[PDB]
Every structure is written in C-alpha cells, then in structure tokens.
Design a protein around this ligand. Structure first.
Ligand SMILES: *[C@@H]1O[C@H](CO)[C@@H](O[C@@H]2O[C@H](CO)[C@@H](O)[C@H](O)[C@H]2NC(C)=O)[C@H](O)[C@H]1NC(C)=O
Ligand SMILES: *C(=O)c1ccc(NC(=N)N)cc1
Length: 326
C-alpha cells in the first residue's frame, strides 16, 4: 500500500485517499526500506525533501510506523527514487538511432535471430509484450537479450544475456491482445554505462497531454511485409485520444483502458512487425518514462490504422509485485 506519485516521485501511503509522507525524521534507510517494499530489491538512488493531510513517522518501536498528521514540522514531503533511470544522450518513416539515445532498448533473440523488442527497467528486469512469449516461446531457455548494440550484425551468438524467467500478465487475452505485457528476468545482471541504462516506470498522476509527444524505437520492418531492420530506428509519435482511436473509422471500440494509441491518423510513421514488446517513451520533468509497450495494429503506417500499445501505467503495480515475489 506504498506508491510513488507524479513526475516528482512523491512518496504516498494509502488510508482506507492517498497522502504524502513527511520529511520529518526520514532518512536514506527508511527510503531503502520503502524501495524494497516496492520490489526494487538491491536498487536505491535518492531520498530528499520536496516543497510540494500527511503520513508522519512514529519515533517509537516502514508502513506500520506511520500515522495521520495535519502538518509536517519540516514543511516538506519525501521524494523517493529507487533507481537512476530515464537519462539518455544530452519502425516505418523513422531514422537510425544514435548510440546512447535509447539505452533501455533491447533486442530479444530466439535461434540467433531478432524476434521482439524490450525495455530495461532494472539490471535484471525487462518489460516486453505477452504476445512475444506465447507458446511455443513461453519457456525462458529460448531467449537471449542484446543491450547497447545498435546493429543486428554486431549481436554475436554466445554474447547475449540468457533469460532465466518469463512472466505473462494473468489477464492477457490472445484473441483481443488485451493486457499485452510480460516481464523477462536475466540470469546475469547488466552492466550500466552510457549505452545501457534503464527507462523509468510511469507513476500514477503523470498528467500527460491528450496528444503527448512520444518516441518509439525498434528493429521492426521499415515497410509493411518487410524484413527485420539491421539497424535500430527511432521515430516521434503523438498519443491519439482513446475516444478518437475507438471511432467507427479507426479501431471501432477495440481500445480498452489497458491500451493506448499513438502515431498519426494520416499514417506514414508507425511501429511494425519486429518492434513489438519495445518502448513507447515520453520526456517530462527531464526524465524519460515508459508509457507503452508496442502491442498491435492493422498493417503498418496505413491511414486510420495507428499503433496500439500496452498502457504500462495500468500494469506498474503488477510489475512491482512480480519483482518483489522473485
Ligand atoms: C507510536 O507507537 C506506539 C508504540 O507502538 C503507539 O502506542 C501504542 O498504541 C496502542 C493503541 O493504538 C496501545 O494499545 C499500545 O499499548 C501502545 N504502545 C505503547 C508502547 O504504549 C503510539 O500510539 C504511536 N504513536 C502515534 C502518535 O500513533
Ligand atoms: C508488433 O510487432 C506490431 C505492432 C504494431 C503493428 N502495426 C501498427 N503499429 N500499425 C505491427 C506489428
């Protein structure tokens, strides 16, 4: 019953609404304990008092040691970051990605060939699409991950990161593609550097614009019915309002609250076969956030047939629980 709220990572605790935690008597050790509860295990980044009813710490005997208070004597609330994420440098109709521009991007291989995309969230956890791991690719032995390499010809056999665990959302529906999200855990943790870094998981209360400016990246075909791209490509896309995406001329009521549309109704710029499982990201408060995972669409870059992505914000607490359960 502990969460991070908005682009400023305000620590909140639930009461049978949600209230922010006082900076009073708080320290890095309480922050570490809060991150462990969220399933971040050994990950911790920062804990600081932001000037934004409250939950106050009881200096007697992490969640059970908080009580409701009218005011914070420190006149600040806790801002909690569990991992250094969402920092980078500085597909149809896109452009070659630069080194370090999309450092959370991974290429997921089966039998030495790219199958799907993925997004690094921790040194051992990757977010992908549940449709990527449908039978007969449900078992983790099939899979290997490539990070910090832009080119498929530079992804050598024996050099990938073996996948040890595969977890599909319990409500994934293969007919409709509803709840199209899965997690992969690596056998060995990744080494973060200027080319390999995680993207931030989205917090409730991001307050994105109806047509928020986003980016997609992947090794998917550069034209409908085309082959896997040898190079990583990236493109700017705008969110498409669900009411508009659900209209008779677009996807006629097939867009659920677990899905987000992005792209252009005139087409020309879109995700395609092989981009699936990959990131849909946005920049807000100088942080890159994982808004979606490439899920589905009718054809590629066709007019009135945009891209459909898993609504990652809806899945964040399910993700936390799987990371904690491991
Ligand atoms: C801070 O913690 C103490 C100790 O857990 C709380 O005191 C207990 O309150 C319950 C009733 O809710 C009593 O049954 C216990 O006997 C109390 N314990 C002790 C050691 O006296 C205290 O209420 C908490 N402070 C606040 C402001 O909530
Ligand atoms: C997955 O590989 C995938 C996702 C989306 C599309 N189509 C569109 N974005 N229109 C194809 C394939």
């Amino acid at each position: 019953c502990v969460r991070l709220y908005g682009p400023n990572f305000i620590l909140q605790v639930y009461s049978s609404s949600w209230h922010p935690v006082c900076q009073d008597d708080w320290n890095e050790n309480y922050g570490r304990a809060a991150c462990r509860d969220m399933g971040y295990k050994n990950n911790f980044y920062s804990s600081q008092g932001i000037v934004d009813s409250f939950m106050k710490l009881n200096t007697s005997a992490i969640y059970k040691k908080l009580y409701h208070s009218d005011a914070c004597s420190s006149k600040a609330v806790v801002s909690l970051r569990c991992i250094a994420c969402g920092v980078n440098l500085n597909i149809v109709g896109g452009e070659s990605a630069l080194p370090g521009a999309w450092p959370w991007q991974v290429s997921l291989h089966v039998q030495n060939v790219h199958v799907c995309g993925g997004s690094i969230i921790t040194p051992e956890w990757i977010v992908t699409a549940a449709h990527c791991v449908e039978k007969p690719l449900n078992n983790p032995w099939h899979w290997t991950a490539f990070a910090g390499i832009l080119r498929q010809s530079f992804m050598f056999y024996g050099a990938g990161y073996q996948v040890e665990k595969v977890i599909s959302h319990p409500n994934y529906d293969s007919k409709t593609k509803n709840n199209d999200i899965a997690l992969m855990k690596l056998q060995k943790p990744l080494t973060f550097n200027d080319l390999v870094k995680p993207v931030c998981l989205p917090n409730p209360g991001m307050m994105l614009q109806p047509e928020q400016l986003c980016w997609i990246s992947g090794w998917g075909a550069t034209e409908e019915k085309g082959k896997t791209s040898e190079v990583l490509n990236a493109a700017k896309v705008l969110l498409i309002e669900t009411q508009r995406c659900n209209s008779r001329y677009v996807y006629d009521n097939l867009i659920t609250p677990a899905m987000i549309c992005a792209g252009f109704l005139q087409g020309n710029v879109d995700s395609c076969q092989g981009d699936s499982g990959g990131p849909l990201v946005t920049s807000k408060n100088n942080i890159w956030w994982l808004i979606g995972d490439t899920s589905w669409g009718s054809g590629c870059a066709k007019a009135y047939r945009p891209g459909v992505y898993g609504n990652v914000m809806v899945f964040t607490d399910w993700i936390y629980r799987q990371m904690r359960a491991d």
